[PDB]
Design a protein around this ligand. Structure first.
Ligand SMILES: COc1cccc(CNC(=O)c2nc3ccccc3c(=O)[nH]2)c1
Ligand SMILES: [Ca+2]
Ligand SMILES: [Ca+2]
Ligand code: NA
Ligand SMILES: [Zn+2]
Ligand SMILES: [Zn+2]
Length: 166
């Protein structure tokens, strides 16, 4: 017999993701780089492995959309809502949607795709928001070498463990 896990987490360490489509704002390579770095923020401090799929069903389906894009969380045009991701689970669970009415960048301009993705993937992995205004999982986007704040380390490790500590 099995009771449901105490916290929403992935019950496997091996997770897949798929960049279903791409923003106009950045090259394919820039987007892939951003997401790759955003996943590594989490795999570096846990035992989580992330494999990119080019096609098929992945645990974390990543896409760029505007307004109504197939969930109960329609985007709202420029500014306001930026992105959202769903907590671990089947189907839309783990999926991350980015508002392509935002300007996504690999700089301090518009919204940094990597930074928002790293945050979003926190949600995909079971983290909600933090009260720590320094934390990656803080509810409000601000822009600053990236280092995962200790609050986010503690949160994610409470879910998945530290993985290899060295
Ligand atoms: C969709 O809402 C979002 C989206 C993304 C981020 C946040 C909140 N965290 C930050 O803004 C942030 N965390 C950091 C953590 C460590 C270093 C720098 C930073 C930094 O420069 N910013 C909310
Ligand atoms: Ca928006
Ligand atoms: Ca999913
Ligand atoms: Na855009
Ligand atoms: Zn959505
Ligand atoms: Zn959030």
């Amino acid at each position: 017999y099995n009771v449901f896990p105490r916290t929403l987490k992935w019950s496997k360490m091996n997770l897949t993701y798929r960049i279903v489509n791409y923003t106009p704002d950045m090259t394919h390579s820039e987007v892939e780089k951003a997401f790759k770095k955003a996943f590594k923020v989490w795999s570096d401090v846990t035992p989580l492995n992330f494999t990119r799929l080019h096609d098929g069903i992945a645990d974390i389906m990543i896409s760029f959309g505007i307004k109504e894009h197939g969930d109960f969380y329609p985007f709202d045009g420029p500014s306001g809502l930026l992105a959202h991701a769903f907590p671990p689970g089947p189907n839309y669970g783990g999926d991350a949607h980015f508002d392509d009415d935002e300007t996504w960048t690999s700089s301090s301009k518009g919204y940094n795709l990597f930074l928002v993705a790293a945050h979003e993937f926190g949600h995909s992995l079971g983290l909600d928001h933090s009260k720590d205004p320094g934390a990656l999982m803080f509810p409000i986007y601000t822009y600053t070498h990236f280092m995962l704040p200790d609050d986010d380390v503690q949160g994610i490790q409470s879910l998945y463990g530290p993985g290899d500590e060295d």
